[PDB]
Amino acid sequence: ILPVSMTKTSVDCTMYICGDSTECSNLLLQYGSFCTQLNRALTGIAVEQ
Amino acid sequence: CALDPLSETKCTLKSFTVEKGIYQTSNFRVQPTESIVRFPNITNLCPFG
Numbered sequence: 001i002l003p004v005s006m007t008k009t010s011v012d013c014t015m016y017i018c019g020d021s022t023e024c025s026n027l028l029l030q031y032g033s034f035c036t037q038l039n040r041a042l043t044g045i046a047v048e049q
Numbered sequence: 050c051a052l053d054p055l056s057e058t059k060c061t062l063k064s065f066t067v068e069k070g071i072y073q074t075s076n077f078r079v080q081p082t083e084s085i086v087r088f089p090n091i092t093n094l095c096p097f098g
């Protein structure tokens with residue numbers, strides 16, 4: 001038996017870290033490109049699987 | 050980055066030519082149509098009389 005694929009999860013900060021919070025949303029965009037990176041990391045995993 | 054679904058791709062990839070494929074441009078969420086504040090029916094009114 002050999003694992004081949006994995007669950008193709010995909011996070012979204014602007015809803016995970018905080019949903020329906022615009023003040024958190026612009027506070028997030030103050031942090032910068034963490035979350036465009038994380039969606040990039042996880043879509044890289046998802047394409048990989 | 051707001052008129053065409055294609056334009057959002059051009060804008061997320063930061064390129065004016067978008068290669069063939071599928072691109073996760075942005076995210077959407079159906080917004081709360083209204084607010085439903087609900088509490089138990091009054092059960093212990095005070096006798097001001």
Ligand SMILES: *[C@@H]1O[C@H](CO)[C@@H](O)[C@H](O)[C@H]1NC(C)=O
Nearest residue numbers: 091092093094095096097098
């Ligand atoms: C006093 O009686 C009147 C009669 O019309 C009533 O409208 C009123 O609500 C009563 N007030 C209290 C505090 O019980």
